[PDB]
Amino acid sequence: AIPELTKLLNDEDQVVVNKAAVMVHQLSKKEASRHAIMRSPQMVSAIVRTMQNTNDVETARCTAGTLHNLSHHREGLLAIFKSGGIPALVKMLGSPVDSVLFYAITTLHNLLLHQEGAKMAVRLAGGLQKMVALLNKTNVKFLAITTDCLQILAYGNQESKLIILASGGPQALVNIMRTYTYEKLLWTTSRVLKVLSVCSSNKPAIVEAGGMQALGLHLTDPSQRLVQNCLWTLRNLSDAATKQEGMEGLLGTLVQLLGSDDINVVTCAAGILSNLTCNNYKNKMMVCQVGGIEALVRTVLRAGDREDITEPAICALRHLTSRHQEAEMAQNAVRLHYGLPVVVKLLHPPSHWPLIKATVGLIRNLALCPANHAPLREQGAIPRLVQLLVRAHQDTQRRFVEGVRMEEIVEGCTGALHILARDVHNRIVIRGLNTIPLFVQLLYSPIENIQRVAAGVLCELAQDKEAAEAIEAEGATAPLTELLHSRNEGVATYAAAVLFRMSE
């Protein structure tokens, strides 16, 4: 009856197409007849023309249901695809009744999963915009199919991620994250957000929509694939969420998550916490109150050579030990939690430059606490900081290694030595390493920040007349008198200080 049935759909009068629709639908639920529907292109075409032109809701539900049943096999799938189907079901994603909406999204989903060239076809028809507009629906199974469709198209396609963003993608995807509990929908939604989080233009939109807090709600779910997709997305956005409020719950969970047995969970937790504590005084406190210093120290002790874990954890320790209230107590807490020996050890190989630069800054802030001077000394921090300073300064004299700025090590090492020189015992070790020639040669550096730490460590060393004479013997008076009129006030203050202690 297939040859005759194409005409009843290519004909006016409702019931004629309606009956035919409520007649081809039945020839679709039976395998013998259905095998003949896909076999005929005139049939397949006629149902597409009827579906996207119909006025009656039963024809729309019966047609879209017929092509949905066609989409379960390869020959029917490409029959939909070849007869210009995808543009029609994309149109049907704007229907006001839920039956055709369900039928269209499942047929498009099957095409996106099993039809070659359907991802390009759906993209061009404006599918991404329609799929995002459907994210406000309430059927979680419908939402699970719709978000998986978006994931199929957004994955590895930059143009797709931009279109999703322009349609309010992040906010609608974040809303799903903080509303529903169906694991498959949460896991699929998290896949979409993970794909979007690697795009710099989607990063602030997900953050501004509250996506950080929304992902934190599911960090304790029993689904391992859901927590890790949540953690990967949080890691990506972390650098663009340093201003968000309401981070108390998320930060609390991340601190607890540092003790996880899973390697990927710990790495992500340290990475998120590092970025989240950077220049956010409020985050620095909250992490300290939930005992983050202890957690990060134990995390570092557990990692050993795993630099993908120690680099972010030490960064977070560096953030939590400076420029906020509890920084003083956080400086003591690293020592009281048996952290000092591991920090100094990480200055030595096989640590690479990213880890070293982060460790130096931590030691710099750790040295602000005078109770850390002796235990840092007995770990060998002074000769190692000088070894790094000499090598870094030797490289800048060639007239960027491992991604780090080589003069940033000169500023960081000399600055840490400046702090340590506050203690008299440390001064002995600094002086005994033949470093005064190096500290005077750094006064001729053009980088104002290097001139400051150099004059600083020279100022502390000059408390002792023997050291002040050696410094004078290296011809420091001339660059110091010039640095008196430096545009940088901190250098002029430091330069005046070294010249003053040269009283004898």
Binding site: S322, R364, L368, V453, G490, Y494, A496
Partner: peptide, 16 residues
């Protein structure tokens, strides 16, 4: 004195 209290004030600025 004078020059030294200058230094301690600029030292707190540099790190604390």
């Amino acid at each position: 004195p004078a020059v030294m209290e200058c230094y301690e004030a600029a030292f707190i600025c540099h790190y604390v």
